[PDB]
Amino acid sequence: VSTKPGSCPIILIRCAMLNPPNRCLKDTDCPGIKKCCEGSCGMACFVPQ
């Protein structure tokens, strides 16, 4: 899952879904430097810090 440098953001907001849709499963599914991270509603690609 985590291969690229930097860290995923901490997100303290969630949708009320047991199985929200993932736009990515690992970092290499995301373009550029972006990491695959637990977002507010399923996995998503984020610019890391």
Curated annotation (Swiss-Prot):
It comes from the Eukaryota. Disulfide bonds join 8-37, 15-41, 24-36, 30-45. The gene is PI3. It comes from Homo sapiens. Consists of two domains: the transglutaminase substrate domain (cementoin moiety) and the elastase inhibitor domain. The transglutaminase substrate domain serves as an anchor to localize elafin covalently to specific sites on extracellular matrix proteins. It is found in: Secreted. Residues 1-49 form the WAP domain. Neutrophil and pancreatic elastase-specific inhibitor of skin. It may prevent elastase-mediated tissue proteolysis. Has been shown to inhibit the alpha-4-beta-2/CHRNA2-CHRNB2 nicotinic acetylcholine receptor and to produce a weak inhibition on Kv11.1/KCNH2/ERG1 and on the transient receptor potential cation channel subfamily V member 1 (TRPV1). The lineage of its organism: Eukaryota, Metazoa, Chordata, Craniata, Vertebrata. This is Elafin.
